[PDB]
mmCIF file of C-alpha atoms in Angstrom:
data_model
loop_
_atom_site.group_PDB
_atom_site.id
_atom_site.type_symbol
_atom_site.label_atom_id
_atom_site.label_comp_id
_atom_site.label_asym_id
_atom_site.label_seq_id
_atom_site.Cartn_x
_atom_site.Cartn_y
_atom_site.Cartn_z
ATOM 1 C CA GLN A 1 73.725 41.442 145.181
ATOM 2 C CA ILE A 2 70.244 42.306 143.223
ATOM 3 C CA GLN A 3 70.437 45.063 141.012
ATOM 4 C CA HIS A 4 66.915 47.251 139.929
ATOM 5 C CA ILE A 5 66.835 48.350 136.126
ATOM 6 C CA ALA A 6 63.773 50.402 135.714
ATOM 7 C CA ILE A 7 62.452 49.963 131.989
ATOM 8 C CA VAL A 8 60.098 52.546 129.728
ATOM 9 C CA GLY A 9 57.838 52.411 128.151
ATOM 10 C CA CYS A 10 56.917 55.804 125.770
ATOM 11 C CA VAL A 11 58.756 58.677 127.068
ATOM 12 C CA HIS A 12 57.425 61.194 124.858
ATOM 13 C CA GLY A 13 58.994 63.777 126.238
ATOM 14 C CA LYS A 14 57.949 64.186 129.765
ATOM 15 C CA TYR A 15 61.217 63.260 130.471
ATOM 16 C CA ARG A 16 60.606 64.753 135.294
ATOM 17 C CA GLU A 17 57.433 63.399 134.998
ATOM 18 C CA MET A 18 59.374 59.805 134.185
ATOM 19 C CA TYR A 19 62.120 60.534 136.742
ATOM 20 C CA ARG A 20 59.985 61.966 139.667
ATOM 21 C CA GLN A 21 57.521 58.542 139.568
ATOM 22 C CA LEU A 22 61.825 57.301 139.331
ATOM 23 C CA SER A 23 62.162 58.986 142.904
ATOM 24 C CA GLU A 24 59.722 58.094 144.237
ATOM 25 C CA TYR A 25 60.307 54.078 143.580
ATOM 26 C CA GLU A 26 63.952 54.674 145.204
ATOM 27 C CA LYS A 27 61.726 55.943 147.970
ATOM 28 C CA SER A 28 59.046 53.990 148.269
ATOM 29 C CA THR A 29 60.298 50.787 148.394
ATOM 30 C CA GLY A 30 63.615 51.974 149.040
ATOM 31 C CA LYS A 31 65.511 49.743 146.527
ATOM 32 C CA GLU A 32 68.084 51.683 144.331
ATOM 33 C CA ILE A 33 68.297 52.354 140.874
ATOM 34 C CA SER A 34 70.675 50.822 138.707
ATOM 35 C CA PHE A 35 70.020 52.445 136.310
ATOM 36 C CA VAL A 36 67.053 53.624 133.273
ATOM 37 C CA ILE A 37 66.589 51.283 129.966
ATOM 38 C CA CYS A 38 63.098 53.526 127.862
ATOM 39 C CA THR A 39 61.448 51.159 124.566
ATOM 40 C CA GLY A 40 61.647 54.316 122.633
ATOM 41 C CA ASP A 41 60.002 58.333 121.520
ATOM 42 C CA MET A 42 62.231 59.906 123.254
ATOM 43 C CA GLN A 43 61.411 63.131 122.033
ATOM 44 C CA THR A 44 65.347 64.335 122.439
ATOM 45 C CA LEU A 45 64.370 67.957 120.596
ATOM 46 C CA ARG A 46 66.799 70.571 121.589
ATOM 47 C CA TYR A 47 65.096 73.178 120.158
ATOM 48 C CA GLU A 48 61.777 74.101 118.117
ATOM 49 C CA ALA A 49 64.114 73.775 114.926
ATOM 50 C CA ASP A 50 64.629 70.155 115.405
ATOM 51 C CA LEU A 51 60.009 69.703 115.506
ATOM 52 C CA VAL A 52 59.906 69.406 111.314
ATOM 53 C CA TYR A 53 61.608 65.977 112.504
ATOM 54 C CA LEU A 54 59.201 65.140 114.854
ATOM 55 C CA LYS A 55 56.607 62.555 113.954
ATOM 56 C CA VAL A 56 53.917 63.337 115.045
ATOM 57 C CA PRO A 57 49.318 63.917 114.887
ATOM 58 C CA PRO A 58 49.527 67.775 114.977
ATOM 59 C CA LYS A 59 47.976 68.238 119.140
ATOM 60 C CA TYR A 60 51.971 66.649 120.071
ATOM 61 C CA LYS A 61 54.167 68.826 118.603
ATOM 62 C CA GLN A 62 55.362 70.061 121.526
ATOM 63 C CA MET A 63 59.492 70.320 122.498
ATOM 64 C CA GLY A 64 58.846 68.405 125.685
ATOM 65 C CA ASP A 65 60.913 68.129 128.961
ATOM 66 C CA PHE A 66 64.434 67.315 127.368
ATOM 67 C CA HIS A 67 65.330 70.767 126.596
ATOM 68 C CA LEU A 68 66.175 70.605 130.347
ATOM 69 C CA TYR A 69 68.328 68.650 130.609
ATOM 70 C CA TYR A 70 70.018 70.101 127.087
ATOM 71 C CA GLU A 71 70.560 72.807 128.438
ATOM 72 C CA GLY A 72 71.779 72.120 131.666
ATOM 73 C CA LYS A 73 68.653 73.353 133.379
ATOM 74 C CA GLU A 74 67.862 69.530 134.301
ATOM 75 C CA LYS A 75 70.233 66.449 135.016
ATOM 76 C CA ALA A 76 68.831 63.152 134.828
ATOM 77 C CA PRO A 77 69.398 61.327 138.107
ATOM 78 C CA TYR A 78 69.488 58.614 137.167
ATOM 79 C CA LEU A 79 72.003 57.065 133.539
ATOM 80 C CA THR A 80 69.236 56.148 131.114
ATOM 81 C CA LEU A 81 69.767 53.754 127.743
ATOM 82 C CA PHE A 82 67.269 53.975 125.105
ATOM 83 C CA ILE A 83 66.349 53.407 121.263
ATOM 84 C CA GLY A 84 64.044 54.826 119.235
ATOM 85 C CA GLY A 85 60.729 54.721 118.917
ATOM 86 C CA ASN A 86 58.101 56.520 115.940
ATOM 87 C CA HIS A 87 57.988 60.029 117.927
ATOM 88 C CA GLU A 88 61.654 61.135 117.699
ATOM 89 C CA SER A 89 63.931 64.351 116.564
ATOM 90 C CA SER A 90 65.407 61.533 114.058
ATOM 91 C CA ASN A 91 68.094 63.951 112.861
ATOM 92 C CA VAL A 92 69.598 63.653 116.285
ATOM 93 C CA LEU A 93 69.156 59.912 115.871
ATOM 94 C CA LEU A 94 70.456 59.569 112.926
ATOM 95 C CA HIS A 95 73.425 62.157 114.005
ATOM 96 C CA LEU A 96 74.141 59.427 116.254
ATOM 97 C CA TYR A 97 73.093 56.432 114.558
ATOM 98 C CA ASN A 98 76.527 54.742 116.044
ATOM 99 C CA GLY A 99 74.827 55.867 119.790
ATOM 100 C CA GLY A 100 76.068 59.224 122.226
ATOM 101 C CA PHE A 101 74.604 60.432 124.490
ATOM 102 C CA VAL A 102 72.321 63.214 123.676
ATOM 103 C CA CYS A 103 72.705 64.217 127.339
ATOM 104 C CA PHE A 104 74.579 63.926 130.697
ATOM 105 C CA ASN A 105 74.041 60.342 131.884
ATOM 106 C CA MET A 106 70.763 60.005 128.130
ATOM 107 C CA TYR A 107 72.612 57.263 126.471
ATOM 108 C CA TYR A 108 71.151 56.379 123.004
ATOM 109 C CA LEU A 109 72.155 52.745 121.046
ATOM 110 C CA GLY A 110 72.518 53.992 117.936
ATOM 111 C CA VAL A 111 70.089 52.543 114.813
ATOM 112 C CA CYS A 112 70.687 49.551 116.795
ATOM 113 C CA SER A 113 74.413 47.522 119.048
ATOM 114 C CA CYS A 114 75.373 45.848 121.917
ATOM 115 C CA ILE A 115 76.100 47.586 125.439
ATOM 116 C CA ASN A 116 78.237 46.190 128.395
ATOM 117 C CA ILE A 117 77.225 47.268 132.573
ATOM 118 C CA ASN A 118 77.037 45.969 135.046
ATOM 119 C CA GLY A 119 78.027 41.937 134.422
ATOM 120 C CA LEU A 120 74.726 42.735 131.541
ATOM 121 C CA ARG A 121 74.532 42.193 127.184
ATOM 122 C CA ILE A 122 71.967 44.777 126.259
ATOM 123 C CA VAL A 123 70.542 45.149 122.898
ATOM 124 C CA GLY A 124 68.700 47.297 120.627
ATOM 125 C CA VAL A 125 67.078 47.848 117.975
ATOM 126 C CA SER A 126 65.545 51.151 116.586
ATOM 127 C CA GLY A 127 61.797 52.023 115.334
ATOM 128 C CA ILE A 128 59.301 50.460 114.218
ATOM 129 C CA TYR A 129 58.832 48.517 111.426
ATOM 130 C CA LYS A 130 56.853 48.621 107.642
ATOM 131 C CA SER A 131 58.216 46.716 104.409
ATOM 132 C CA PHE A 132 58.509 49.608 101.793
ATOM 133 C CA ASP A 133 61.374 51.344 103.082
ATOM 134 C CA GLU A 134 63.428 48.012 105.075
ATOM 135 C CA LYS A 135 65.664 48.068 102.331
ATOM 136 C CA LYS A 136 65.749 52.355 101.837
ATOM 137 C CA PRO A 137 69.376 53.110 103.353
ATOM 138 C CA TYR A 138 69.754 56.549 105.006
ATOM 139 C CA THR A 139 70.316 59.680 104.177
ATOM 140 C CA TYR A 140 72.823 62.587 104.862
ATOM 141 C CA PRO A 141 72.925 64.868 106.804
ATOM 142 C CA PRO A 142 68.718 64.478 107.399
ATOM 143 C CA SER A 143 66.542 66.492 105.899
ATOM 144 C CA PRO A 144 63.126 67.378 106.597
ATOM 145 C CA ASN A 145 61.077 65.930 103.933
ATOM 146 C CA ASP A 146 62.897 62.431 105.781
ATOM 147 C CA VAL A 147 60.820 62.484 108.785
ATOM 148 C CA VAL A 148 58.322 60.022 107.397
ATOM 149 C CA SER A 149 61.100 57.606 107.314
ATOM 150 C CA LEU A 150 64.051 57.895 109.221
ATOM 151 C CA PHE A 151 62.103 55.997 112.365
ATOM 152 C CA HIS A 152 61.833 52.968 109.866
ATOM 153 C CA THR A 153 63.392 49.706 111.162
ATOM 154 C CA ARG A 154 66.054 49.070 108.037
ATOM 155 C CA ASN A 155 66.485 44.644 108.043
ATOM 156 C CA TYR A 156 70.215 45.310 107.542
ATOM 157 C CA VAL A 157 70.399 44.927 110.966
ATOM 158 C CA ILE A 158 69.137 41.193 111.474
ATOM 159 C CA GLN A 159 72.746 41.124 109.955
ATOM 160 C CA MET A 160 74.095 43.495 112.311
ATOM 161 C CA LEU A 161 73.121 41.947 115.587
ATOM 162 C CA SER A 162 72.417 38.015 114.880
ATOM 163 C CA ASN A 163 75.828 37.110 115.091
ATOM 164 C CA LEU A 164 76.150 39.042 118.754
ATOM 165 C CA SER A 165 75.121 35.343 120.820
ATOM 166 C CA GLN A 166 78.438 33.476 119.890
ATOM 167 C CA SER A 167 80.442 33.955 122.528
ATOM 168 C CA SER A 168 77.926 35.116 125.473
ATOM 169 C CA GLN A 169 74.734 35.370 126.520
ATOM 170 C CA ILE A 170 72.353 38.429 125.500
ATOM 171 C CA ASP A 171 70.394 39.728 128.965
ATOM 172 C CA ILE A 172 68.201 42.119 127.570
ATOM 173 C CA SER A 173 67.086 43.087 124.159
ATOM 174 C CA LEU A 174 65.362 46.041 123.214
ATOM 175 C CA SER A 175 62.005 47.361 120.692
ATOM 176 C CA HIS A 176 60.115 49.629 120.198
ATOM 177 C CA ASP A 177 57.601 47.850 118.611
ATOM 178 C CA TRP A 178 56.770 44.062 119.988
ATOM 179 C CA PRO A 179 58.634 41.129 118.089
ATOM 180 C CA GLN A 180 55.683 39.468 115.691
ATOM 181 C CA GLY A 181 54.058 36.335 116.939
ATOM 182 C CA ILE A 182 55.071 37.600 120.071
ATOM 183 C CA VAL A 183 50.978 38.932 121.098
ATOM 184 C CA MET A 184 49.496 35.125 121.044
ATOM 185 C CA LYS A 185 52.592 33.967 123.349
ATOM 186 C CA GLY A 186 50.312 35.503 126.635
ATOM 187 C CA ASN A 187 46.783 35.704 127.286
ATOM 188 C CA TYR A 188 46.491 37.818 124.645
ATOM 189 C CA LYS A 189 42.147 37.201 124.556
ATOM 190 C CA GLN A 190 42.054 39.153 128.287
ATOM 191 C CA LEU A 191 44.318 41.014 126.005
ATOM 192 C CA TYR A 192 41.542 41.587 123.297
ATOM 193 C CA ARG A 193 39.154 42.981 125.634
ATOM 194 C CA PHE A 194 41.003 45.721 127.262
ATOM 195 C CA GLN A 195 42.746 46.244 123.712
ATOM 196 C CA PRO A 196 39.689 45.587 121.139
ATOM 197 C CA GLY A 197 42.030 47.268 117.769
ATOM 198 C CA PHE A 198 44.685 43.936 118.299
ATOM 199 C CA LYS A 199 41.812 41.050 117.451
ATOM 200 C CA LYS A 200 42.684 42.045 113.358
ATOM 201 C CA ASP A 201 46.332 42.074 112.548
ATOM 202 C CA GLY A 202 46.569 38.112 114.895
ATOM 203 C CA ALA A 203 49.881 36.927 114.179
ATOM 204 C CA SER A 204 51.057 38.837 111.958
ATOM 205 C CA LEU A 205 51.347 42.706 114.734
ATOM 206 C CA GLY A 206 54.443 42.908 115.214
ATOM 207 C CA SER A 207 57.136 44.135 113.812
ATOM 208 C CA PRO A 208 59.293 40.703 111.447
ATOM 209 C CA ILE A 209 62.691 42.533 111.851
ATOM 210 C CA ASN A 210 62.378 42.202 116.225
ATOM 211 C CA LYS A 211 60.895 38.783 115.093
ATOM 212 C CA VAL A 212 63.760 36.999 113.455
ATOM 213 C CA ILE A 213 66.224 39.165 116.214
ATOM 214 C CA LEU A 214 64.776 37.349 119.101
ATOM 215 C CA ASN A 215 64.642 33.390 117.364
ATOM 216 C CA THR A 216 68.169 34.093 117.255
ATOM 217 C CA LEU A 217 69.467 34.917 119.852
ATOM 218 C CA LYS A 218 67.125 34.333 121.957
ATOM 219 C CA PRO A 219 67.751 36.564 125.230
ATOM 220 C CA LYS A 220 66.662 36.355 129.011
ATOM 221 C CA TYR A 221 64.302 39.446 128.200
ATOM 222 C CA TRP A 222 62.983 41.467 125.328
ATOM 223 C CA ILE A 223 61.210 44.237 126.629
ATOM 224 C CA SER A 224 59.102 47.093 123.893
ATOM 225 C CA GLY A 225 56.505 49.545 123.835
ATOM 226 C CA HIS A 226 54.930 51.764 120.891
ATOM 227 C CA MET A 227 51.327 49.974 121.536
ATOM 228 C CA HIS A 228 50.827 52.325 125.270
ATOM 229 C CA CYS A 229 49.475 48.999 126.931
ATOM 230 C CA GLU A 230 50.647 46.592 129.606
ATOM 231 C CA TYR A 231 51.378 42.868 128.859
ATOM 232 C CA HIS A 232 53.897 39.813 129.293
ATOM 233 C CA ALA A 233 54.330 36.420 127.007
ATOM 234 C CA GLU A 234 57.518 33.709 126.802
ATOM 235 C CA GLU A 235 58.589 33.120 123.363
ATOM 236 C CA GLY A 236 60.799 29.934 124.901
ATOM 237 C CA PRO A 237 62.935 31.000 126.867
ATOM 238 C CA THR A 238 62.740 34.232 126.633
ATOM 239 C CA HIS A 239 60.388 37.122 128.523
ATOM 240 C CA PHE A 240 58.524 38.608 126.940
ATOM 241 C CA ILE A 241 57.338 41.735 128.197
ATOM 242 C CA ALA A 242 55.504 45.028 127.237
ATOM 243 C CA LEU A 243 55.263 49.107 128.818
ATOM 244 C CA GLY A 244 53.144 51.799 127.680
ATOM 245 C CA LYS A 245 52.649 55.160 128.047
ATOM 246 C CA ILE A 246 54.645 58.088 130.433
ATOM 247 C CA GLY A 247 51.144 58.907 132.594
ATOM 248 C CA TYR A 248 49.297 56.072 133.055
ATOM 249 C CA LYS A 249 50.306 53.025 135.589
ATOM 250 C CA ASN A 250 51.845 50.509 132.978
ATOM 251 C CA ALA A 251 54.697 53.131 131.426
ATOM 252 C CA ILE A 252 57.556 51.703 134.084
ATOM 253 C CA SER A 253 58.004 48.499 135.798
ATOM 254 C CA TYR A 254 61.340 46.538 137.505
ATOM 255 C CA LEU A 255 63.457 44.357 136.591
ATOM 256 C CA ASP A 256 65.477 43.333 139.603
ATOM 257 C CA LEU A 257 69.064 40.770 138.288
ATOM 258 C CA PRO A 258 71.931 38.968 139.861
ATOM 259 C CA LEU A 259 74.805 41.739 139.672
ATOM 260 C CA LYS A 260 77.967 39.973 140.226
ATOM 261 C CA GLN A 261 79.977 43.703 139.611
ATOM 262 C CA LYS A 262 79.124 46.776 139.578
ATOM 263 C CA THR A 263 80.614 48.468 135.797
ATOM 264 C CA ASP A 264 80.607 51.347 134.287
ATOM 265 C CA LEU A 265 79.037 51.772 130.909
ATOM 266 C CA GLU A 266 81.256 49.923 127.508
ATOM 267 C CA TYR A 267 81.223 49.615 125.183
ATOM 268 C CA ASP A 268 80.530 45.547 123.851
ATOM 269 C CA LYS A 269 83.301 43.952 122.043
ATOM 270 C CA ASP A 270 81.194 41.654 119.635
ATOM 271 C CA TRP A 271 79.293 44.371 118.549
ATOM 272 C CA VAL A 272 82.892 46.840 118.583
ATOM 273 C CA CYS A 273 83.805 44.384 116.136
ATOM 274 C CA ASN A 274 81.184 43.866 113.717
ATOM 275 C CA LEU A 275 81.031 47.690 113.756
ATOM 276 C CA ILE A 276 84.953 48.199 112.526
ATOM 277 C CA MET A 277 85.005 45.488 109.350
ATOM 278 C CA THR A 278 81.278 46.166 108.148
ATOM 279 C CA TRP A 279 82.820 49.912 107.547
ATOM 280 C CA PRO A 280 82.696 49.001 103.307
ATOM 281 C CA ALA A 281 79.319 49.482 103.538
ATOM 282 C CA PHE A 282 79.265 52.535 105.659
ATOM 283 C CA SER A 283 81.772 54.660 103.549
ATOM 284 C CA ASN A 284 80.149 56.734 101.877
ATOM 285 C CA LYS A 285 78.786 59.218 104.625
ATOM 286 C CA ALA A 286 75.987 60.876 102.085
ATOM 287 C CA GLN A 287 74.214 57.261 102.209
ATOM 288 C CA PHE A 288 75.004 54.190 104.038
ATOM 289 C CA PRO A 289 74.225 50.903 104.080
ATOM 290 C CA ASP A 290 75.396 49.847 100.956
ATOM 291 C CA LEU A 291 74.083 47.148 100.399
ATOM 292 C CA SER A 292 76.237 46.551 97.426
ATOM 293 C CA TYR A 293 78.023 44.654 100.388
ATOM 294 C CA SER A 294 76.629 41.469 101.640
ATOM 295 C CA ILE A 295 76.393 43.136 105.552
ATOM 296 C CA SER A 296 77.342 38.633 106.369
ATOM 297 C CA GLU A 297 79.510 37.936 104.297
ATOM 298 C CA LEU A 298 81.637 41.721 105.810
ATOM 299 C CA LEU A 299 81.101 40.269 109.082
ATOM 300 C CA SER A 300 82.550 36.181 108.470
ATOM 301 C CA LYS A 301 86.049 37.496 107.952
ATOM 302 C CA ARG A 302 86.003 37.371 111.713
ATOM 303 C CA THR A 303 89.444 36.165 113.229
ATOM 304 C CA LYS A 304 90.382 36.243 117.081
ATOM 305 C CA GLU A 305 93.203 37.639 116.119
ATOM 306 C CA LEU A 306 91.759 40.447 114.214
ATOM 307 C CA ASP A 307 88.685 41.042 117.140
ATOM 308 C CA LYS A 308 91.900 40.937 119.384
ATOM 309 C CA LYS A 309 93.534 43.582 117.392
ATOM 310 C CA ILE A 310 90.512 45.688 116.235
ATOM 311 C CA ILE A 311 89.781 46.005 120.258
ATOM 312 C CA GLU A 312 92.898 46.921 121.265
ATOM 313 C CA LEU A 313 92.978 49.151 118.495
ATOM 314 C CA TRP A 314 89.436 51.206 119.555
ATOM 315 C CA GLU A 315 91.083 50.502 123.410
ATOM 316 C CA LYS A 316 93.586 53.217 122.606
ATOM 317 C CA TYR A 317 91.939 55.895 120.143
ATOM 318 C CA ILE A 318 88.326 55.233 121.763
ATOM 319 C CA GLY A 319 88.581 53.870 125.277
ATOM 320 C CA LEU A 320 86.458 50.982 126.023
ATOM 321 C CA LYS A 321 84.253 52.659 128.816
ATOM 322 C CA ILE A 322 81.489 55.209 127.415
ATOM 323 C CA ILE A 323 81.995 58.456 128.546
ATOM 324 C CA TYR A 324 80.297 62.099 127.674
ATOM 325 C CA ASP A 325 80.494 64.044 125.293
ATOM 326 C CA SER A 326 79.745 67.027 124.361
ATOM 327 C CA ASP A 327 80.196 67.816 121.105
ATOM 328 C CA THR A 328 77.412 68.431 118.466
ATOM 329 C CA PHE A 329 76.271 65.627 117.573
ATOM 330 C CA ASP A 330 76.699 65.994 113.671
ATOM 331 C CA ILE A 331 80.870 66.230 115.265
ATOM 332 C CA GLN A 332 80.256 63.898 117.033
ATOM 333 C CA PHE A 333 78.628 61.655 113.811
ATOM 334 C CA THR A 334 82.133 62.482 111.749
ATOM 335 C CA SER A 335 83.719 62.096 114.905
ATOM 336 C CA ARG A 336 83.046 58.190 115.519
ATOM 337 C CA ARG A 337 83.283 57.272 111.723
ATOM 338 C CA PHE A 338 87.011 58.658 111.426
ATOM 339 C CA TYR A 339 88.049 55.975 113.978
ATOM 340 C CA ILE A 340 85.524 53.232 112.027
ATOM 341 C CA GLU A 341 87.344 53.977 109.381
ATOM 342 C CA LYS A 342 91.578 54.469 111.450
ATOM 343 C CA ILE A 343 91.524 50.844 112.973
ATOM 344 C CA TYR A 344 89.772 49.226 109.854
ATOM 345 C CA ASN A 345 92.199 51.060 107.731
ATOM 346 C CA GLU A 346 94.761 49.720 109.965
ATOM 347 C CA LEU A 347 94.638 46.102 110.265
ATOM 348 C CA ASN A 348 95.300 45.754 106.382
ATOM 349 C CA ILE A 349 93.087 43.482 104.253
#
């Protein structure tokens, strides 16, 4: 048993092109794709109004193909899991900061999370790194002036993800910009003559946040995009792979991983437990996280008995399976934290 997983770099609204290339792989090679993985820049703009939240150079203020899938005119032939990049409809992703389906077969992993599928555990870290925004909170509802800062990776995702490898391995981890320093653990001199601009950042190229997460969880694979080029590197037990932009040859690659059993997309129990126990830091819907709280301190109260009950209550109110929901995203925002708060308060701490 083998499962073929498509890994995609920057999509930037070229969905019909991506699915055209994916469908030819299934027939040129005869292998079947289990699901698709995207490293960001999805541009999930539902309508013209969402263009205000797309931080791009003037030439790329374009709707893309997403609205056709959002409208139902097009249908994603494969289940597509993605994170956010630096060219996004950032308002939509903030509504879904705890993940959610933007349309059929297209699931956003949120600001960060861990999911389960086909016996694998997949971690996603959205955004790119900017030091001046790494401590800023999110303000809700989204405002057009936040178009420049909403896609910047926040420091707190480090504390939210660091313990996810304690009970079991992490198979795949997703980020947009590369983990800082990973440029040096491959054939960097070959890369420096195809990408001359990479020479001056040296080992500082990439996100320190994604660097910390990689060293803590050491997943089997770490996949990134952002840089619009192909690259491989090894950092201890972790295989790093970088992908390019849709429209070039370097956009899509394929992972052939062992398949124990076929399983629907499900929430990760350890992630769900971190999401419930960190609720007091997210209790203010207008501004979160409230970093007066220590995220690690809230998570140090996790117990096996409390974890068993959180998943019991999560299964009751939401379900272990991640299912499609077609409510508007602002309603999905309120709904998911309604049940996070309900599960947390039902524990009585």
